[PDB]
């Protein structure tokens with residue numbers, strides 16, 4: 278299995294969700310960036326694995342589930358089996374990441390992308406080891422009811438370049454945003 282990564286888009290007030298959807302209106306190219314990053318595998322004959330909480334799964338329009346071209350894993354302790362359309366169910370992050378080591382997935386999975394929500398991001402981010410954060414900074418405040426956890430910049434270095442990530446300010450629907458990549462290893 279290759280690298281471990283989180284990806285998120287977050288407002289200035291650290292918002293990531295409101296009433297089961299995003300705080301901001303649809304940003305088509307920002308969603309396209311999510312799809313390109315999470316789907317693109319560095320490695321022949323492998324796909325990437327996306328790990329998400331149960332509310333995040335059901336927050337994705339059903340027409341777009343499972344996230345195509347990626348192995349979809351949902352985190353839930355209440356569910357008894359993967360939701361309709363999902364591929365795997367795990368009861369904890371550690372369990373998910375261990376599954377990736379099992380014979381079924383061991384040689385199938387390239388990158389692992391944690392795609393939220395808040396609890397899974399916080400655990401991933403505080404877990405020892407080599408981890409990148411792909412963070413889209415939505416450059417306005419938006420009313421939110423779900424927030425991104427604190428990034429500790431003592432450990433997460435903002436990278437001054439990354440191949441394939443545009444460095445200039447984007448704008449869609451009158452909303453400016455910019456892409457960032459953080460890396461720790463502890």
Ligand SMILES: NC(=O)C1=CN([C@@H]2O[C@H](COP(=O)(O)OP(=O)(O)OC[C@H]3O[C@@H](n4cnc5c(N)ncnc54)[C@H](OP(=O)(O)O)[C@@H]3O)[C@@H](O)[C@H]2O)C=CC1
Nearest residue numbers: 285286294297298330331332333352353354355393394395
């Ligand atoms: N802007 C962005 O990048 C992102 C936005 N969002 C937004 O965030 C909201 C959804 O996020 P959030 O409310 O945090 O919810 P989650 O997606 O984290 O779902 C929470 C549920 O997932 C299960 N769960 C979470 N973590 C684990 C774990 N480690 N192990 C086992 N089960 C776990 C639970 O289900 P159970 O009770 O069944 O055990 C828990 O009730 C929506 O508004 C969505 O649009 C989501 C991701 C990214």
Ligand SMILES: Cc1sc2nc(N)[nH]c(=O)c2c1Sc1ccc(C(=O)N[C@@H](CCC(=O)O)C(=O)O)cc1
Nearest residue numbers: 284285286308309311312337341344345392393413
């Ligand atoms: C769960 C996360 S992590 C994340 N990270 C960044 N940068 N931006 C986001 O908006 C999200 C979200 S919320 C989200 C909701 C729906 C979708 C979605 O429908 N994606 C489809 C469609 C992408 C497209 O519209 O092209 C896919 O990836 O195949 C993706 C992310």
